[PDB]
Amino acid sequence: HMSMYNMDLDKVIRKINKKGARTVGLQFPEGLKMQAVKIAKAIESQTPATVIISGDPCFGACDVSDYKMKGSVDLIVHYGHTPLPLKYEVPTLFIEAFSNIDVKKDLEKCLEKLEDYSKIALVTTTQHLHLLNEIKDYLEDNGKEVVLGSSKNTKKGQVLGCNFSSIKNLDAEVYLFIGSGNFHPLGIYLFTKSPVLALDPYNSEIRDISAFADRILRIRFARITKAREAEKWGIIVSSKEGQYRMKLAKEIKKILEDNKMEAYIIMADNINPDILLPYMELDAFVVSACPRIAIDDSQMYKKPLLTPQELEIVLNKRQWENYQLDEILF
Amino acid sequence: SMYNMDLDKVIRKINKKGARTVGLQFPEGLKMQAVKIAKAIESQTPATVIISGDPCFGACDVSDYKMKGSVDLIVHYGHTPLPLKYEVPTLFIEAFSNIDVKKDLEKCLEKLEDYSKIALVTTTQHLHLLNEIKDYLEDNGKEVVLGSSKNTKKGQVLGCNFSSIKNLDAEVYLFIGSGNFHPLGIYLFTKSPVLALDPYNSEIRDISAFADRILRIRFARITKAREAEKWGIIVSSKEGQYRMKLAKEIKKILEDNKMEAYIIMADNINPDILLPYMELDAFVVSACPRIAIDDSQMYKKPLLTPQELEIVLNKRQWENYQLDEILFH
Ligand SMILES: CSC[C@H]1O[C@@H](n2cnc3c(N)ncnc32)[C@H](O)[C@@H]1O
Ligand SMILES: CSC[C@H]1O[C@@H](n2cnc3c(N)ncnc32)[C@H](O)[C@@H]1O
Ligand code: SF4
Ligand code: SF4
Ligand SMILES: [Cl-]
């Protein structure tokens, strides 16, 4: 009852023992790191392995610790994300850490919020993927047509903050997102221009995303207005394997120099305000790393941080009506 | 400029090597010069510059793993190289301080009146000042000795390697530079008088000024850690700081003393990354030895060196306190 997520310890331990691993790395996103010692203690009690907890941030499957842990561990257990189509330097076991939730209490609330629509797309992220089939079957049992988008690199019904490909060609009347966060509903909204609803399986509240979307876009507009006065730019690259986009960074550099501005590529692992402070000549920054940084963290930075698409608006190459979130595609 | 950035030589080196992409690595105090240097390199060579934005604390902290495949050459400022196997070819630039030390020579001599045999000690960025200081003291009746070690040049130390000052037998040690850590280590290893000249602001400080407050802090942290029942052992993935063998030995030792211990690996260590390990009462740092000593004020829970843990477990007497060192990599 106390476990908010299924950490699948039984499976993790059986696989550790069968693999014969003697040193095992653990990676957790921010919301799961509090469980690291409990899980490490269980693994060490039931296997001959020594656990190495990765204390570094872990923002997604773009951010596996295989480069840093190469030579230190035989196996990495990575929680919270499904794997990206990358080749990892160290054997890695991905545990979804599914939400411990019964959504049956909310099915009737969802049906009433959907009374005006026949054709419904269901979307969520990794830790609620296990709920989609129950919701889909309920809706279909109540006269609805339910579609789950897929892609070459995302599971049925799944989006990532940098990959909305699976919701782009669905032709639904309404998109129901499962989750408390607003960034994924924002991208579904902007790409589909269709109604987007979102169920918080904890609040049991269903919300419309249109209001949050306009609030974010007003902020993006104000940041872009400031960036139009920029003369010298930083282009931010991350060395994180799934985030690394040096080809794009060099393309952006040439574009800025073609527009008679200075531009300098800066590469870091974790991006934060403190690492940008020394470069006092730079007026604004374009992020070639995680597409969510410029949108979700912008209030932490004094100077404007922009996506490449937003840089296109600065340069009058993209119009506001075609505002678009950044994505990473493999 | 405050430091000789040796720009003409870096540019000469880039062109001869034919580098198309060049990485730049700076410690904190030099990062603000990154844009001017990138601008000059890109103006005078065909290369594109990548500024390493990550924190950089020493030669232990080269970005050759992160930059691997991105750059043909790395220019690294402010440090002398460590005996590591650098993946990407690297060019180390000392970044010597742009200081004229003449104004402080008589003041140094005045503070050294009681002594005949004087050791001079400094770090990379002030090594170029030592000859002028040494020659002045010798013109004024002093015997001046400079220590050396296999990897550290004449008169130089680092925060994890004090071997060059352990066999000098001087009456007093004059450290050139800011900060308390290096003079604290000289004092602890020699138990001799140690004076420190900060060449930027010309202040000369004695032992109590850089050692008393810190030793009392360490003693208090040790006392608090005697109550700890569950431990974290911090390892760094940074090539020059990696001590996993030691970390695993410390884990086994703590388990022999009927306590729990968990190895946590991180790149950069900071208070925020220890907040989720709420069950842990104390930490032992098996990474850069300066972390536990210099940054203790940032962490609520005790962060100890391995030698301080020895004191907690009653395997080392407090009187035999010893700073941590990385002797082998
Ligand atoms: C919730 S996962 C997305 C968030 O993770 C954080 N994030 C992702 N990648 C990075 C990075 N390379 N550096 C710092 N923060 C990141 C940003 O805050 C982003 O909004
Ligand atoms: C001035 S170089 C020594 C300083 O660098 C910092 N430092 C060295 N290694 C690390 C690390 N792995 N993580 C965070 N800070 C470090 C510590 O603050 C120390 O006081
Ligand atoms: S949105 Fe950012 S953190 Fe999430 S998978 Fe994509 S790049 Fe990684
Ligand atoms: S003292 Fe620490 S920062 Fe300086 S070289 Fe040694 S390990 Fe690196
Ligand atoms: Cl690329």
DSSP string, A110-147: HHHHTTT-SEEEEEE-GGGGGGHHHHHHHHHHTT-EEE
Q: Do B262 and A53 touch (CB under 8 A)?
A: yes
How many Cβ contacts (< 8 angstroms) between chains A and B?
Answer: 111
Ligand 2 interacting residues, C-beta cut-off 6 A: B 57-58, 159, 236, 238, 241, 268-269, 287-288, 290-291, 294-295
Backbone CA torsion sign across A76, A297, A276, B288: negative
Q: Give backbone dihedrals phi and psi of B40, rounded to 5 degrees, phi first.
A: -70, -45
Ligand 4 interacting residues, C-beta cut-off 6 A: B 57-60, 158-160, 240-241, 288-290, 326
Nearest listed ligand to the Cα of residue A268:
1
Q: Which residues surround ligand 5, an ion (CB under 5 A)?
A: A 246-247
C-alpha B194 chain-centroid distance: 18
Gyration radius of chain A over CA positions: 22
Q: Is beta strand A196-200 parallel, antiparallel or unpaired with respect to A205-208?
A: antiparallel
Contacts of A279 in chain B (CB under 8 A): 31-32, 34-35, 51
> If you take atom 5 of ligand 4, which residue's CA is the nearest one?
B58
What the block records as the tokens of A271 is 């991006």
CA dihedral B37, B43, B44, B45 (to 10 degrees): 90
Q: Do A40 and B244 touch (CB under 8 A)?
A: no
3-state secondary structure chain B: CCECCCHHHHHHHHHHHCCCEEEEECCHHHHHHHHHHHHHHHHHCCCEEEEECCCCCCHHHCCCCCCCCCCCEEEEECCCCCCCCCCCCEEEECCCECCCHHHHHHHHHHHCCCCCEEEEEECHHHHHHHHHHHHHHHHCCCEEECCCCCCCCCCECECCECHHHCCCCCCEEEEECCCCHHHHHHHHHHCCCEEEECCCCCCEECHHHHHHHHHHHHHHHHHHHCCCCEEEEEEECCHHHCCHHHHHHHHHHHHHCCCEEEEEEECCCCHHHHCCCCCCCEEEECCCCHHHHHCHHHCCCCEECHHHHHHHCCCCCHHHCCCCCCCCC
Distance from CA of A166 to the nearest CA of B (A): 32
Contact status, residue B60 vs residue B237, Cβ threshold 8 Å:
no
3-state secondary structure A181-225: CCHHHHHHHHHHCCCEEEEECCCCEEEECHHHHHHHHHHHHHHHH
Q: Which helix (H) or strand (E) holds A258?
A: helix A246-258
Q: What residue has token string 């220890």?
A: B274
Q: Is B60 annotated as a binding residue?
A: yes
Measured between CA atoms, the residue of chain A closest to residue B279 is A37
- The resolution, in angstroms to one decimal, equals 1.8
Q: Do B262 and A67 touch (CB under 8 A)?
A: no
Distance from CA of B264 to the nearest CA of A (A): 5
CA of B289 to the centre of ligand 4 (A): 7
Instruction: Name A50's bridge partners.
Output: A23
CA-CA distance, B16 to B11, in Å (whole number)? 9
Contact status, residue A24 vs residue A12, Cβ threshold 8 Å:
no
Which domains does chain B possess? 7-93 (3.40.50.11840), 102-210 (3.40.50.11850), 211-320 (3.40.50.11860)
Instruction: Name A147's bridge partners.
Output: A121
Please indicate the experimental technique that yielded this structure.
Answer: X-ray
Number of alpha carbons in the 13 Å side-chain half-sphere of residue A135: 30
Nearest listed ligand to the Cα of residue A236:
1
Q: Do B53 and A281 touch (CB under 8 A)?
A: no
Q: Is B160 annotated as a binding residue?
A: yes
Q: Is A110 annotated as a binding residue?
A: no
Q: Do A266 and B70 touch (CB under 8 A)?
A: no
Q: Is the CB of A187 under 6 A from ligand 3?
A: no
